[PDB]
Design an enzyme around this catalytic site. Structure first.
Site, short mmCIF file in Angstrom:
data_model
loop_
_atom_site.label_atom_id
_atom_site.label_comp_id
_atom_site.label_asym_id
_atom_site.label_seq_id
_atom_site.Cartn_x
_atom_site.Cartn_y
_atom_site.Cartn_z
N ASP A 86 0.75 -1.27 0.00
CA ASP A 86 0.07 0.19 -0.06
C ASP A 86 0.97 1.26 0.13
O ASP A 86 1.90 1.32 0.03
CB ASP A 86 -0.91 -0.03 1.02
CG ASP A 86 -2.24 0.77 0.82
OD1 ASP A 86 -2.46 1.24 -0.12
OD2 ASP A 86 -3.07 0.98 1.95
O1 LIG Z 1 0.69 -7.60 3.61
C1 LIG Z 1 0.06 -6.49 3.96
C2 LIG Z 1 -0.69 -6.23 4.93
C3 LIG Z 1 -1.21 -5.07 5.03
N1 LIG Z 1 -0.96 -3.78 4.09
C4 LIG Z 1 0.11 -4.22 3.27
O2 LIG Z 1 0.49 -3.48 2.16
N2 LIG Z 1 0.63 -5.51 3.19
#
Ligand SMILES: O=c1cc[nH]c(=O)[nH]1
Length: 234
Positions: free
Chosen positions: A105
């Site tokens: 993310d």
């Molecule tokens: O593995 C994960 C879990 C939550 N958010 C992320 O970017 N990766």
């Protein structure tokens, strides 16, 4: 400076041994830039245009693999147009052919593997496969003492059917822990801690299978993977 022997290229393309590719090259059946080349050892460059019996053989550029220390504020795909992608940090030709074999993310940092080898990638990311990933997690509150057991048995995410596969938690400080999971559900780490009453404040990925992020690779920096890392990720 990619390049390769003309005989290895032909063997690759026709599905024959290097020894038989050499026979064909000497048999006057191979051309480069329109001229007949009879030397099996000819050094083929990307700009060269090869032909076999008149039929053009486009050059399939070797697969590339990179280790990137992902920083906050950037995303790992073009799905969302409101934020810049990690390709901003890569200074490579036709970099847009590269994708993340496991996305992170916008504000999650750490290990991201960039590649254009789709088979290598699927092997690592398939939801049916067991590939371990380790994260360094910073929490809002001191971890609860039954959370390790919880994660060991498996927890249920808010409105999901199946429990999460067993995961191991190691406490570093009361608000900083290391977590290893073998799954890849959407936002799994944040949802796991939410389920047990906590909140993830920062998240950094240190490992994927047999590849660990270099201790001296600064955020935004990246490097080609070694032959060993490629052959042993998982
Ligand atoms: O593995 C994960 C879990 C939550 N958010 C992320 O970017 N990766």
């Amino acid at each position: 400076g990619s390049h390769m022997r003309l005989d290895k290229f032909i063997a690759q393309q026709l599905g024959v041994s290097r020894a038989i590719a050499g026979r064909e090259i000497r048999g006057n059946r191979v051309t480069v830039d329109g001229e007949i080349v009879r030397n099996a050892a000819f050094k083929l460059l990307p700009e060269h245009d090869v032909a076999y019996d008149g039929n053009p053989l486009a050059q399939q550029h070797g697969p590339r693999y990179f280790m990137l220390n992902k920083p906050q504020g950037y995303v790992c795909s073009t799905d969302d147009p409101d934020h810049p992608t990690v390709l901003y940090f890569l200074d490579e030709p036709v970099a847009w052919k590269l994708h993340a074999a496991g996305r992170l993310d916008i504000d999650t940092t750490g290990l991201v593997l960039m590649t254009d080898d789709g088979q290598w990638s699927h092997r690592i990311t398939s939801p049916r496969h067991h590939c371990e990933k380790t994260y360094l997690v910073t929490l809002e509150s001191p971890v609860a003492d039954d959370t390790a057991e919880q994660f060991a048995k498996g927890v249920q995410l808010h409105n999901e059917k199946d429990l999460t596969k067993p995961a191991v938690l190691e406490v570093i400080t009361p608000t900083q822990v290391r977590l290893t999971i073998s799954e890849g559900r959407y936002h799994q780490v944040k949802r796991m801690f939410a389920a047990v009453g906590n909140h993830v404040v920062e998240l950094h990925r240190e490992r994927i299978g047999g590849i660990t992020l270099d201790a001296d690779l600064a955020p935004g920096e990246y490097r080609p993977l070694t032959e060993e890392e490629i052959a042993s990720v998982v």
